[PDB]
Protein backbone atom coordinates (compact mmCIF):
# COMPACT_ATOMS: atom_id res chain seq x y z
CA UNK A 1 0.00 0.00 0.00
CA UNK A 2 0.90 3.70 -0.32
CA UNK A 3 0.79 5.99 -3.37
CA UNK A 4 3.56 8.21 -4.64
CA UNK A 5 4.42 10.40 -7.66
CA UNK A 6 6.82 7.71 -8.86
CA UNK A 7 9.30 8.24 -11.64
CA UNK A 8 10.96 5.50 -13.72
CA UNK A 9 14.46 4.44 -12.60
CA UNK A 10 16.77 6.88 -14.44
CA UNK A 11 19.89 4.72 -15.00
CA UNK A 12 19.36 3.85 -18.68
CA UNK A 13 19.00 7.59 -19.40
CA UNK A 14 21.90 8.76 -17.17
CA UNK A 15 24.23 6.72 -19.39
CA UNK A 16 23.05 8.71 -22.44
CA UNK A 17 23.59 12.22 -21.01
CA UNK A 18 26.40 14.30 -22.48
CA UNK A 19 27.41 18.00 -22.43
CA UNK A 20 27.22 19.99 -25.68
CA UNK A 21 29.13 23.29 -26.05
CA UNK A 22 29.02 25.54 -29.10
CA UNK A 23 30.41 29.06 -29.06
CA UNK A 24 29.77 30.27 -25.51
CA UNK A 25 26.61 28.16 -24.89
CA UNK A 26 26.47 24.85 -23.07
CA UNK A 27 23.49 22.52 -22.70
CA UNK A 28 22.64 18.78 -22.46
CA UNK A 29 22.80 16.24 -25.25
CA UNK A 30 21.37 12.76 -25.60
CA UNK A 31 23.86 10.21 -26.88
CA UNK A 32 22.18 7.17 -28.50
CA UNK A 33 24.23 5.01 -30.90
CA UNK A 34 26.64 7.33 -32.83
CA UNK A 35 24.33 10.40 -32.59
CA UNK A 36 24.04 13.24 -30.06
CA UNK A 37 20.65 15.02 -29.97
CA UNK A 38 20.37 18.47 -28.38
CA UNK A 39 18.23 21.64 -28.76
CA UNK A 40 19.34 23.62 -31.81
CA UNK A 41 19.51 26.88 -29.83
CA UNK A 42 22.97 25.67 -28.65
CA UNK A 43 24.34 27.58 -31.71
CA UNK A 44 22.78 30.87 -30.54
CA UNK A 45 24.07 33.79 -28.50
CA UNK A 46 21.75 36.05 -26.44
CA UNK A 47 21.63 38.69 -29.23
CA UNK A 48 20.22 36.33 -31.86
CA UNK A 49 17.83 34.51 -29.45
CA UNK A 50 15.36 37.40 -30.08
CA UNK A 51 14.70 36.28 -33.70
CA UNK A 52 17.16 33.55 -34.77
CA UNK A 53 17.62 32.40 -38.32
CA UNK A 54 18.84 28.89 -37.37
CA UNK A 55 19.66 27.88 -40.94
CA UNK A 56 21.91 30.96 -41.33
CA UNK A 57 23.44 30.55 -37.84
CA UNK A 58 24.13 26.84 -38.41
CA UNK A 59 25.94 27.71 -41.71
CA UNK A 60 28.67 29.52 -39.73
CA UNK A 61 29.27 26.29 -37.72
CA UNK A 62 31.51 23.32 -38.51
CA UNK A 63 31.70 19.83 -36.82
CA UNK A 64 34.76 21.06 -34.85
CA UNK A 65 32.67 23.87 -33.25
CA UNK A 66 30.41 21.39 -31.42
CA UNK A 67 32.22 20.23 -28.32
CA UNK A 68 30.61 17.04 -27.02
CA UNK A 69 31.86 15.68 -23.69
CA UNK A 70 30.60 12.35 -22.27
CA UNK A 71 31.62 12.49 -18.61
CA UNK A 72 35.24 13.56 -18.86
CA UNK A 73 35.98 12.22 -22.37
CA UNK A 74 35.73 14.15 -25.58
CA UNK A 75 33.64 12.78 -28.43
CA UNK A 76 34.74 13.52 -32.01
CA UNK A 77 32.04 15.17 -34.19
CA UNK A 78 31.96 13.83 -37.77
CA UNK A 79 28.57 15.21 -38.90
CA UNK A 80 25.94 17.80 -37.96
CA UNK A 81 22.40 18.42 -39.17
CA UNK A 82 19.27 20.17 -38.06
CA UNK A 83 15.97 18.24 -37.87
CA UNK A 84 13.24 20.73 -36.93
CA UNK A 85 14.35 22.31 -33.52
CA UNK A 86 17.06 19.72 -32.67
CA UNK A 87 20.59 19.24 -33.84
CA UNK A 88 21.86 15.73 -34.52
CA UNK A 89 25.61 15.52 -34.08
CA UNK A 90 27.10 12.38 -35.58
CA UNK A 91 29.96 11.15 -33.39
CA UNK A 92 32.64 8.57 -34.35
CA UNK A 93 31.83 6.30 -31.34
CA UNK A 94 28.58 4.51 -30.56
CA UNK A 95 27.49 5.05 -26.90
CA UNK A 96 28.40 1.75 -25.19
CA UNK A 97 25.59 2.42 -22.70
CA UNK A 98 22.80 2.90 -25.30
CA UNK A 99 19.68 1.12 -24.02
CA UNK A 100 16.95 -0.37 -26.28
CA UNK A 101 15.19 2.89 -27.27
CA UNK A 102 12.33 4.39 -29.27
CA UNK A 103 11.42 7.98 -30.11
CA UNK A 104 7.74 8.57 -29.34
CA UNK A 105 5.41 11.53 -29.45
CA UNK A 106 3.19 11.37 -26.39
CA UNK A 107 -0.39 12.55 -26.25
CA UNK A 108 -1.55 15.39 -23.99
CA UNK A 109 -2.58 13.99 -20.59
CA UNK A 110 0.14 11.28 -20.81
CA UNK A 111 2.82 11.18 -18.12
CA UNK A 112 6.61 10.68 -18.22
CA UNK A 113 9.76 10.84 -16.13
CA UNK A 114 12.22 13.72 -16.52
CA UNK A 115 15.91 13.47 -15.73
CA UNK A 116 16.89 17.11 -15.12
CA UNK A 117 20.52 17.69 -16.15
CA UNK A 118 23.16 20.46 -16.01
CA UNK A 119 26.42 20.34 -18.02
CA UNK A 120 25.66 16.74 -19.07
CA UNK A 121 25.29 15.61 -15.43
CA UNK A 122 22.01 14.47 -13.88
CA UNK A 123 20.75 16.29 -10.80
CA UNK A 124 17.34 14.68 -10.24
CA UNK A 125 14.36 12.70 -11.55
CA UNK A 126 10.65 13.57 -11.27
CA UNK A 127 7.35 12.39 -12.77
CA UNK A 128 5.29 14.91 -14.72
CA UNK A 129 2.52 15.10 -17.38
CA UNK A 130 2.15 16.66 -20.78
CA UNK A 131 -0.56 19.24 -19.96
CA UNK A 132 -3.55 19.49 -22.36
CA UNK A 133 -2.02 22.89 -23.43
CA UNK A 134 1.25 21.02 -24.34
CA UNK A 135 3.37 22.57 -21.62
CA UNK A 136 4.88 20.67 -18.69
CA UNK A 137 5.18 21.97 -15.13
CA UNK A 138 8.75 20.88 -14.57
CA UNK A 139 11.57 22.15 -12.43
CA UNK A 140 14.23 23.53 -14.72
CA UNK A 141 16.94 26.16 -14.50
CA UNK A 142 19.32 27.75 -17.06
CA UNK A 143 21.52 24.93 -18.42
CA UNK A 144 18.75 22.31 -18.17
CA UNK A 145 18.01 22.50 -21.93
CA UNK A 146 18.50 19.10 -23.59
CA UNK A 147 17.20 17.28 -20.46
CA UNK A 148 14.81 14.52 -21.63
CA UNK A 149 11.48 12.98 -20.66
CA UNK A 150 10.93 9.25 -21.11
CA UNK A 151 8.98 6.08 -20.24
CA UNK A 152 10.31 2.47 -19.80
CA UNK A 153 8.66 -0.75 -21.03
CA UNK A 154 10.68 -3.63 -19.48
CA UNK A 155 14.10 -2.75 -21.06
CA UNK A 156 13.11 -0.22 -23.78
CA UNK A 157 13.36 3.54 -23.13
CA UNK A 158 10.76 5.56 -25.07
CA UNK A 159 12.13 9.08 -25.25
CA UNK A 160 9.20 11.46 -25.57
CA UNK A 161 10.47 14.90 -24.59
CA UNK A 162 13.49 17.18 -24.83
CA UNK A 163 13.43 20.42 -22.79
CA UNK A 164 13.96 23.66 -24.69
CA UNK A 165 12.35 26.70 -23.18
CA UNK A 166 11.00 28.32 -20.09
CA UNK A 167 7.91 30.43 -20.71
CA UNK A 168 7.55 33.83 -18.96
CA UNK A 169 4.85 32.10 -16.87
CA UNK A 170 7.47 29.67 -15.45
CA UNK A 171 5.98 26.69 -17.31
CA UNK A 172 8.08 24.58 -19.65
CA UNK A 173 8.05 23.92 -23.38
CA UNK A 174 9.98 21.44 -25.45
CA UNK A 175 10.03 19.04 -28.34
CA UNK A 176 9.71 15.34 -29.15
CA UNK A 177 13.07 13.64 -30.23
CA UNK A 178 12.59 14.69 -33.88
CA UNK A 179 12.66 18.40 -32.80
CA UNK A 180 8.92 19.00 -33.15
CA UNK A 181 7.67 21.26 -30.37
CA UNK A 182 4.71 20.09 -28.36
CA UNK A 183 2.21 22.92 -28.65
CA UNK A 184 2.40 26.13 -30.65
CA UNK A 185 5.80 27.15 -29.21
CA UNK A 186 8.79 28.32 -31.22
CA UNK A 187 12.43 28.45 -29.96
CA UNK A 188 12.55 32.27 -29.79
CA UNK A 189 12.88 34.77 -26.94
CA UNK A 190 9.42 36.21 -27.46
CA UNK A 191 6.42 36.05 -25.09
CA UNK A 192 4.25 33.12 -26.21
CA UNK A 193 0.69 32.19 -25.19
CA UNK A 194 0.57 28.89 -23.28
CA UNK A 195 -3.21 28.67 -23.73
CA UNK A 196 -5.93 27.58 -21.31
CA UNK A 197 -5.07 24.42 -19.48
CA UNK A 198 -7.63 21.85 -18.35
CA UNK A 199 -7.63 19.08 -15.71
CA UNK A 200 -7.03 15.58 -17.13
CA UNK A 201 -10.34 14.01 -16.06
CA UNK A 202 -9.39 10.38 -16.84
CA UNK A 203 -6.22 10.84 -14.70
CA UNK A 204 -8.13 12.32 -11.74
CA UNK A 205 -10.53 9.36 -11.97
CA UNK A 206 -7.63 6.89 -12.09
CA UNK A 207 -6.16 8.60 -8.97
CA UNK A 208 -9.57 8.29 -7.24
CA UNK A 209 -9.46 4.52 -8.04
CA UNK A 210 -5.86 4.42 -6.57
CA UNK A 211 -7.26 6.17 -3.48
CA UNK A 212 -9.99 3.50 -3.00
CA UNK A 213 -7.33 0.73 -3.49
CA UNK A 214 -5.14 2.32 -0.78
CA UNK A 215 -7.94 2.72 1.81
CA UNK A 216 -9.08 6.31 1.14
CA UNK A 217 -12.86 5.87 0.64
CA UNK A 218 -14.48 8.90 2.36
CA UNK A 219 -15.31 10.48 -1.04
CA UNK A 220 -17.37 7.50 -2.29
CA UNK A 221 -21.10 8.23 -2.34
CA UNK A 222 -24.57 6.69 -2.91
CA UNK A 223 -24.81 8.34 -6.37
CA UNK A 224 -24.23 7.68 -10.01
CA UNK A 225 -24.27 9.92 -13.14
CA UNK A 226 -24.20 9.69 -16.97
CA UNK A 227 -21.37 10.76 -19.38
CA UNK A 228 -23.58 13.71 -20.50
CA UNK A 229 -24.44 14.89 -16.95
CA UNK A 230 -20.81 14.47 -15.75
CA UNK A 231 -19.51 16.38 -18.82
CA UNK A 232 -21.74 19.38 -17.99
CA UNK A 233 -19.88 19.48 -14.56
CA UNK A 234 -16.42 18.88 -16.15
CA UNK A 235 -17.06 21.79 -18.61
CA UNK A 236 -17.89 24.17 -15.66
CA UNK A 237 -14.70 23.25 -13.75
CA UNK A 238 -12.31 23.30 -16.78
CA UNK A 239 -11.98 19.51 -16.79
CA UNK A 240 -11.42 17.57 -20.05
CA UNK A 241 -14.65 16.03 -21.45
CA UNK A 242 -14.85 12.33 -20.55
CA UNK A 243 -15.44 9.93 -23.46
CA UNK A 244 -16.15 6.17 -23.76
CA UNK A 245 -12.41 5.71 -24.68
CA UNK A 246 -11.63 7.11 -21.18
CA UNK A 247 -14.23 4.78 -19.52
CA UNK A 248 -12.74 1.79 -21.44
CA UNK A 249 -9.23 2.51 -20.12
CA UNK A 250 -10.74 2.78 -16.59
CA UNK A 251 -12.18 -0.79 -16.93
CA UNK A 252 -9.29 -2.58 -15.15
CA UNK A 253 -9.54 -0.13 -12.20
CA UNK A 254 -13.33 -0.46 -12.15
CA UNK A 255 -13.07 -4.31 -12.13
CA UNK A 256 -10.52 -4.36 -9.30
CA UNK A 257 -12.58 -2.08 -7.04
CA UNK A 258 -16.09 -3.13 -8.10
CA UNK A 259 -16.96 0.59 -8.49
CA UNK A 260 -18.54 1.33 -11.89
CA UNK A 261 -16.79 4.16 -13.81
CA UNK A 262 -19.96 6.34 -13.82
CA UNK A 263 -20.31 5.78 -10.05
CA UNK A 264 -16.73 7.16 -9.66
CA UNK A 265 -17.63 10.10 -11.98
CA UNK A 266 -20.50 10.87 -9.49
CA UNK A 267 -17.91 10.99 -6.69
CA UNK A 268 -15.78 13.36 -8.83
CA UNK A 269 -18.81 15.55 -9.59
CA UNK A 270 -19.61 15.83 -5.84
CA UNK A 271 -15.92 16.63 -5.06
CA UNK A 272 -15.87 19.33 -7.75
CA UNK A 273 -19.17 20.88 -6.59
CA UNK A 274 -18.44 20.57 -2.83
CA UNK A 275 -14.65 20.59 -2.54
CA UNK A 276 -12.58 18.45 -0.13
CA UNK A 277 -14.06 20.14 3.02
CA UNK A 278 -10.59 20.24 4.59
CA UNK A 279 -10.04 16.51 4.02
CA UNK A 280 -7.28 14.79 2.05
CA UNK A 281 -7.08 12.01 -0.53
CA UNK A 282 -3.74 10.15 -0.76
CA UNK A 283 -2.02 12.96 1.14
CA UNK A 284 -3.36 15.58 -1.27
CA UNK A 285 -5.76 18.46 -0.61
CA UNK A 286 -6.50 18.92 -4.34
CA UNK A 287 -7.58 16.56 -7.13
CA UNK A 288 -4.43 15.03 -8.72
CA UNK A 289 -4.36 14.57 -12.53
CA UNK A 290 -0.75 13.45 -13.15
CA UNK A 291 -1.32 9.69 -12.84
CA UNK A 292 -2.76 7.95 -15.89
CA UNK A 293 -4.90 4.74 -15.44
CA UNK A 294 -1.76 2.83 -16.64
CA UNK A 295 0.37 4.51 -13.94
CA UNK A 296 -2.10 3.53 -11.19
CA UNK A 297 -2.23 -0.16 -12.34
CA UNK A 298 1.60 -0.20 -12.64
CA UNK A 299 2.22 1.30 -9.18
CA UNK A 300 -0.53 -0.78 -7.55
CA UNK A 301 0.83 -4.05 -9.13
CA UNK A 302 4.66 -3.47 -8.96
CA UNK A 303 5.59 -3.75 -12.66
CA UNK A 304 9.41 -3.72 -13.02
CA UNK B 305 11.80 28.07 -12.14
CA UNK B 306 9.34 25.36 -11.05
CA UNK B 307 9.37 23.12 -7.97
CA UNK B 308 9.02 19.37 -7.89
CA UNK B 309 9.33 16.44 -5.43
CA UNK B 310 12.65 15.51 -7.04
CA UNK B 311 14.44 12.27 -6.37
CA UNK B 312 18.17 11.61 -6.93
CA UNK B 313 19.07 9.88 -10.22
CA UNK B 314 18.79 6.15 -9.38
CA UNK B 315 21.48 4.64 -11.66
CA UNK B 316 24.24 4.10 -9.08
CA UNK B 317 21.70 2.19 -6.95
CA UNK B 318 20.10 0.20 -9.81
CA UNK B 319 23.51 -1.40 -10.41
CA UNK B 320 23.55 -2.66 -6.79
CA UNK B 321 20.11 -4.33 -6.80
CA UNK B 322 19.99 -8.12 -6.65
CA UNK B 323 17.33 -10.77 -5.89
CA UNK B 324 17.69 -12.87 -2.73
CA UNK B 325 15.79 -16.18 -2.36
CA UNK B 326 15.86 -18.41 0.71
CA UNK B 327 13.43 -21.26 1.18
CA UNK B 328 10.23 -20.05 -0.49
CA UNK B 329 10.80 -16.29 0.17
CA UNK B 330 12.23 -13.80 -2.28
CA UNK B 331 13.16 -10.17 -1.65
CA UNK B 332 15.71 -7.51 -2.72
CA UNK B 333 19.37 -7.38 -1.81
CA UNK B 334 21.95 -4.63 -2.03
CA UNK B 335 25.22 -5.73 -3.58
CA UNK B 336 28.16 -3.49 -2.58
CA UNK B 337 31.71 -4.87 -2.93
CA UNK B 338 31.60 -8.65 -2.13
CA UNK B 339 28.60 -8.36 0.25
CA UNK B 340 24.83 -8.63 -0.29
CA UNK B 341 22.66 -6.90 2.35
CA UNK B 342 18.99 -7.84 2.70
CA UNK B 343 16.31 -7.95 5.45
CA UNK B 344 16.85 -10.98 7.69
CA UNK B 345 13.19 -12.03 7.42
CA UNK B 346 14.17 -13.64 4.05
CA UNK B 347 14.83 -16.83 6.13
CA UNK B 348 11.26 -16.87 7.48
CA UNK B 349 8.06 -18.59 6.37
CA UNK B 350 4.58 -17.17 7.16
CA UNK B 351 4.18 -19.49 10.20
CA UNK B 352 7.27 -18.19 12.01
CA UNK B 353 6.72 -14.50 11.05
CA UNK B 354 4.33 -14.32 14.07
CA UNK B 355 7.22 -14.61 16.59
CA UNK B 356 10.49 -15.51 14.84
CA UNK B 357 13.61 -16.62 16.63
CA UNK B 358 16.00 -15.40 13.91
CA UNK B 359 19.10 -16.87 15.56
CA UNK B 360 17.45 -20.33 15.65
CA UNK B 361 16.02 -19.98 12.12
CA UNK B 362 19.37 -18.83 10.70
CA UNK B 363 21.06 -21.91 12.28
CA UNK B 364 19.08 -24.20 9.92
CA UNK B 365 20.50 -22.25 6.93
CA UNK B 366 23.74 -22.75 5.02
CA UNK B 367 25.47 -20.47 2.39
CA UNK B 368 24.01 -22.71 -0.37
CA UNK B 369 20.43 -21.94 0.82
CA UNK B 370 20.75 -18.23 -0.06
CA UNK B 371 20.19 -17.85 -3.77
CA UNK B 372 21.51 -14.49 -4.93
CA UNK B 373 20.84 -13.50 -8.55
CA UNK B 374 22.28 -10.27 -10.06
CA UNK B 375 20.21 -9.75 -13.20
CA UNK B 376 20.32 -13.18 -14.78
CA UNK B 377 23.62 -14.40 -13.26
CA UNK B 378 24.00 -16.40 -10.11
CA UNK B 379 26.30 -15.17 -7.36
CA UNK B 380 28.11 -17.75 -5.22
CA UNK B 381 27.56 -17.34 -1.43
CA UNK B 382 30.71 -17.95 0.63
CA UNK B 383 29.59 -16.48 3.98
CA UNK B 384 26.46 -15.42 5.88
CA UNK B 385 25.93 -13.47 9.08
CA UNK B 386 23.23 -11.53 10.83
CA UNK B 387 23.89 -7.93 11.94
CA UNK B 388 20.81 -6.74 13.86
CA UNK B 389 17.80 -7.11 11.38
CA UNK B 390 19.87 -7.56 8.18
CA UNK B 391 21.72 -10.48 6.72
CA UNK B 392 25.10 -9.91 5.10
CA UNK B 393 25.82 -12.53 2.47
CA UNK B 394 29.46 -12.64 1.45
CA UNK B 395 29.72 -13.38 -2.28
CA UNK B 396 32.88 -14.48 -4.18
CA UNK B 397 32.65 -11.56 -6.68
CA UNK B 398 32.85 -7.84 -5.96
CA UNK B 399 30.01 -5.89 -7.69
CA UNK B 400 31.73 -4.26 -10.69
CA UNK B 401 29.10 -1.49 -10.52
CA UNK B 402 29.68 -0.57 -6.83
CA UNK B 403 29.61 3.23 -6.54
CA UNK B 404 31.51 5.24 -3.88
CA UNK B 405 29.21 4.55 -0.89
CA UNK B 406 28.62 5.23 2.81
CA UNK B 407 26.16 3.78 5.30
CA UNK B 408 24.45 6.61 7.19
CA UNK B 409 21.72 6.84 9.78
CA UNK B 410 19.53 9.80 8.89
CA UNK B 411 17.76 12.00 11.38
CA UNK B 412 13.96 12.29 11.55
CA UNK B 413 12.78 15.09 9.23
CA UNK B 414 15.59 14.30 6.74
CA UNK B 415 14.64 13.30 3.20
CA UNK B 416 15.92 10.60 0.81
CA UNK B 417 15.23 8.89 -2.49
CA UNK B 418 13.78 5.37 -2.59
CA UNK B 419 14.30 2.95 -5.46
CA UNK B 420 11.34 0.56 -5.09
CA UNK B 421 12.30 -2.93 -6.32
CA UNK B 422 10.66 -6.33 -6.95
CA UNK B 423 12.67 -9.54 -7.53
CA UNK B 424 15.90 -7.51 -7.69
CA UNK B 425 14.52 -5.27 -10.47
CA UNK B 426 13.75 -1.56 -10.04
CA UNK B 427 10.23 -0.36 -10.76
CA UNK B 428 10.39 3.30 -9.73
CA UNK B 429 12.05 6.12 -7.77
CA UNK B 430 10.41 8.64 -5.42
CA UNK B 431 11.49 11.22 -2.83
CA UNK B 432 10.28 10.78 0.73
CA UNK B 433 11.11 11.81 4.34
CA UNK B 434 11.86 10.01 7.56
CA UNK B 435 8.79 11.08 9.57
CA UNK B 436 9.38 12.35 13.15
CA UNK B 437 7.74 9.03 14.28
CA UNK B 438 10.44 7.11 12.26
CA UNK B 439 8.08 5.72 9.66
CA UNK B 440 8.12 6.65 5.96
CA UNK B 441 5.05 7.10 3.76
CA UNK B 442 6.33 5.12 0.82
CA UNK B 443 4.69 3.10 -1.90
CA UNK B 444 5.57 -0.53 -1.36
CA UNK B 445 4.01 -3.88 -2.13
CA UNK B 446 4.84 -7.50 -1.15
CA UNK B 447 8.30 -8.27 -2.57
CA UNK B 448 9.57 -4.69 -2.08
CA UNK B 449 11.51 -5.65 1.08
CA UNK B 450 15.23 -4.91 0.68
CA UNK B 451 14.48 -1.79 -1.44
CA UNK B 452 16.78 1.02 -0.24
CA UNK B 453 16.66 4.75 0.49
CA UNK B 454 19.69 6.91 -0.27
CA UNK B 455 21.18 10.37 -0.93
CA UNK B 456 23.99 11.36 -3.39
CA UNK B 457 26.85 13.82 -2.76
CA UNK B 458 28.59 14.32 -6.16
CA UNK B 459 29.60 10.63 -6.75
CA UNK B 460 29.06 9.07 -3.28
CA UNK B 461 25.83 7.20 -2.47
CA UNK B 462 24.87 7.43 1.22
CA UNK B 463 22.56 4.51 1.87
CA UNK B 464 20.28 5.42 4.75
CA UNK B 465 17.32 3.05 4.60
CA UNK B 466 16.36 -0.54 3.82
CA UNK B 467 12.63 -1.37 3.64
CA UNK B 468 11.39 -4.16 5.90
CA UNK B 469 7.79 -3.90 6.94
CA UNK B 470 4.39 -2.52 6.19
CA UNK B 471 2.47 -1.45 9.27
CA UNK B 472 -1.28 -2.26 9.54
CA UNK B 473 -1.79 1.51 9.02
CA UNK B 474 -0.20 1.26 5.54
CA UNK B 475 2.90 3.23 6.61
CA UNK B 476 6.38 1.81 6.20
CA UNK B 477 9.11 0.75 8.60
CA UNK B 478 12.68 -0.24 7.98
CA UNK B 479 16.28 -0.15 9.08
CA UNK B 480 19.54 1.69 8.44
CA UNK B 481 22.23 -0.45 6.55
CA UNK B 482 23.50 -1.99 9.81
CA UNK B 483 20.01 -3.54 10.40
CA UNK B 484 18.94 -1.09 13.12
CA UNK B 485 15.27 -0.23 12.76
CA UNK B 486 14.32 3.41 12.67
CA UNK B 487 11.76 3.78 15.45
CA UNK B 488 10.52 1.22 17.96
CA UNK B 489 9.62 -1.37 15.29
CA UNK B 490 10.57 -5.04 15.37
CA UNK B 491 10.52 -7.43 12.34
CA UNK B 492 7.49 -9.42 13.60
CA UNK B 493 3.93 -9.87 12.33
CA UNK B 494 2.38 -8.14 15.32
CA UNK B 495 0.43 -4.85 15.39
CA UNK B 496 2.88 -2.09 16.36
CA UNK B 497 2.22 1.51 17.42
CA UNK B 498 3.59 4.02 14.90
CA UNK B 499 3.20 6.88 17.39
CA UNK B 500 2.00 10.45 16.90
CA UNK B 501 3.53 12.09 13.90
CA UNK B 502 4.27 15.81 13.65
CA UNK B 503 4.83 18.23 10.75
CA UNK B 504 8.51 19.02 10.06
CA UNK B 505 8.36 22.79 10.69
CA UNK B 506 11.83 23.61 9.30
CA UNK B 507 10.89 21.74 6.07
CA UNK B 508 7.56 23.58 5.68
CA UNK B 509 9.45 26.86 6.16
CA UNK B 510 12.06 25.84 3.58
CA UNK B 511 9.19 25.01 1.14
CA UNK B 512 7.66 28.46 1.84
CA UNK B 513 11.07 30.01 0.92
CA UNK B 514 11.05 27.84 -2.32
CA UNK B 515 7.54 29.19 -3.00
CA UNK B 516 8.72 32.84 -2.71
CA UNK B 517 11.73 32.03 -5.01
CA UNK B 518 9.35 30.55 -7.63
CA UNK B 519 6.89 33.49 -7.63
CA UNK B 520 4.28 32.27 -5.11
CA UNK B 521 4.09 35.22 -2.67
CA UNK B 522 0.36 35.56 -1.77
CA UNK B 523 1.00 34.11 1.73
CA UNK B 524 3.60 36.75 2.71
CA UNK B 525 2.26 39.24 5.26
CA UNK B 526 3.03 42.48 7.15
CA UNK B 527 3.77 40.51 10.37
CA UNK B 528 6.59 39.02 12.35
CA UNK B 529 6.72 36.72 15.42
CA UNK B 530 9.21 35.33 18.00
CA UNK B 531 10.44 31.69 18.41
CA UNK B 532 8.36 31.46 21.64
CA UNK B 533 5.14 32.86 20.09
CA UNK B 534 5.53 30.73 16.92
CA UNK B 535 6.18 27.59 19.02
CA UNK B 536 2.89 28.09 20.91
CA UNK B 537 1.16 27.90 17.42
CA UNK B 538 3.33 24.94 16.24
CA UNK B 539 2.42 23.01 19.46
CA UNK B 540 -1.36 23.55 18.78
CA UNK B 541 -1.10 22.28 15.18
CA UNK B 542 1.20 19.26 15.90
CA UNK B 543 4.20 20.95 14.28
CA UNK B 544 7.76 20.28 15.50
CA UNK B 545 9.09 23.03 17.84
CA UNK B 546 11.35 25.41 15.93
CA UNK B 547 14.82 26.00 17.43
CA UNK B 548 17.74 28.36 16.64
CA UNK B 549 19.46 25.36 14.87
CA UNK B 550 16.46 25.37 12.46
CA UNK B 551 16.69 29.20 11.97
CA UNK B 552 20.47 28.86 11.30
CA UNK B 553 19.89 26.28 8.54
CA UNK B 554 17.25 28.64 7.05
CA UNK B 555 19.88 31.45 6.81
CA UNK B 556 20.83 30.82 3.14
CA UNK B 557 17.13 30.87 2.13
CA UNK B 558 16.52 33.98 4.24
CA UNK B 559 19.53 35.76 2.61
CA UNK B 560 18.43 34.89 -0.93
CA UNK B 561 14.87 36.17 -0.43
CA UNK B 562 15.55 39.01 2.02
CA UNK B 563 12.73 37.63 4.23
CA UNK B 564 13.84 37.18 7.85
CA UNK B 565 13.20 33.65 9.24
CA UNK B 566 10.83 34.97 11.97
CA UNK B 567 8.93 36.96 9.30
CA UNK B 568 8.42 33.64 7.41
CA UNK B 569 7.34 31.95 10.70
CA UNK B 570 4.63 34.71 10.95
CA UNK B 571 3.43 33.71 7.46
CA UNK B 572 3.34 30.05 8.60
CA UNK B 573 1.45 30.97 11.78
CA UNK B 574 -1.18 32.86 9.72
CA UNK B 575 -1.46 29.91 7.25
CA UNK B 576 -1.92 27.47 10.16
CA UNK B 577 -4.53 29.66 11.90
CA UNK B 578 -6.38 30.67 8.69
CA UNK B 579 -5.74 27.86 6.22
CA UNK B 580 -5.09 28.27 2.48
CA UNK B 581 -8.60 29.73 1.77
CA UNK B 582 -8.86 27.61 -1.37
CA UNK B 583 -5.52 28.88 -2.71
CA UNK B 584 -2.42 26.88 -3.63
CA UNK B 585 1.31 27.18 -2.98
CA UNK B 586 3.61 25.47 -5.52
CA UNK B 587 0.68 23.42 -6.83
CA UNK B 588 -0.19 22.20 -3.33
CA UNK B 589 -3.33 22.82 -1.27
CA UNK B 590 -1.60 21.75 1.98
CA UNK B 591 1.65 22.73 3.71
CA UNK B 592 4.46 20.48 2.36
CA UNK B 593 7.12 19.23 4.83
CA UNK B 594 9.14 16.78 2.69
CA UNK B 595 11.72 19.26 1.39
CA UNK B 596 14.58 20.11 3.74
CA UNK B 597 16.32 23.57 3.49
CA UNK B 598 19.19 21.67 1.73
CA UNK B 599 16.75 20.20 -0.82
CA UNK B 600 15.32 23.65 -1.65
CA UNK B 601 18.82 25.20 -2.16
CA UNK B 602 19.87 22.16 -4.25
CA UNK B 603 16.78 22.22 -6.50
CA UNK B 604 16.80 26.02 -6.79
CA UNK B 605 20.56 26.04 -7.73
CA UNK B 606 20.86 22.87 -9.92
CA UNK B 607 23.49 20.89 -7.97
CA UNK B 608 24.51 17.79 -9.99
Ligand SMILES: O=C(Cc1cccc(Cl)c1)Nc1cnccc1C1CC1
Pocket residue numbers: 041049140141142143144145164165166167186187188189190305
Ligand atom coordinates in the same frame (compact mmCIF):
# COMPACT_ATOMS: atom_id res chain seq x y z
O1 LIG C 1 14.37 29.24 -21.82
C1 LIG C 1 15.57 29.02 -21.87
C2 LIG C 1 16.46 29.67 -22.91
C3 LIG C 1 15.69 29.88 -24.19
C4 LIG C 1 15.17 31.13 -24.51
C5 LIG C 1 14.37 31.30 -25.63
C6 LIG C 1 14.07 30.22 -26.45
C7 LIG C 1 14.61 28.99 -26.13
CL1 LIG C 1 14.26 27.62 -27.15
C8 LIG C 1 15.41 28.80 -25.03
N1 LIG C 1 16.21 28.20 -21.01
C9 LIG C 1 15.64 27.73 -19.81
C10 LIG C 1 14.90 26.55 -19.76
N2 LIG C 1 14.29 26.09 -18.66
C11 LIG C 1 14.42 26.82 -17.55
C12 LIG C 1 15.14 28.00 -17.48
C13 LIG C 1 15.76 28.48 -18.63
C14 LIG C 1 16.48 29.82 -18.59
C15 LIG C 1 15.68 31.10 -18.58
C16 LIG C 1 16.42 30.68 -17.36
Ligand SMILES: O=C(Cc1cccc(Cl)c1)Nc1cnccc1C1CC1
Pocket residue numbers: 001345353444445446447448449468469470471490491492493494
Ligand atom coordinates in the same frame (compact mmCIF):
# COMPACT_ATOMS: atom_id res chain seq x y z
O1 LIG D 1 5.45 -6.25 5.74
C1 LIG D 1 5.92 -7.08 4.97
C2 LIG D 1 6.23 -8.49 5.42
C3 LIG D 1 6.67 -8.49 6.87
C4 LIG D 1 5.78 -8.85 7.88
C5 LIG D 1 6.15 -8.74 9.21
C6 LIG D 1 7.40 -8.27 9.55
C7 LIG D 1 8.28 -7.94 8.54
CL1 LIG D 1 9.87 -7.35 8.95
C8 LIG D 1 7.94 -8.04 7.21
N1 LIG D 1 6.17 -6.83 3.67
C9 LIG D 1 5.69 -5.69 2.99
C10 LIG D 1 6.42 -4.50 2.95
N2 LIG D 1 5.97 -3.38 2.36
C11 LIG D 1 4.77 -3.43 1.77
C12 LIG D 1 3.98 -4.56 1.75
C13 LIG D 1 4.43 -5.72 2.37
C14 LIG D 1 3.53 -6.95 2.42
C15 LIG D 1 2.37 -6.98 3.37
C16 LIG D 1 2.12 -6.88 1.91
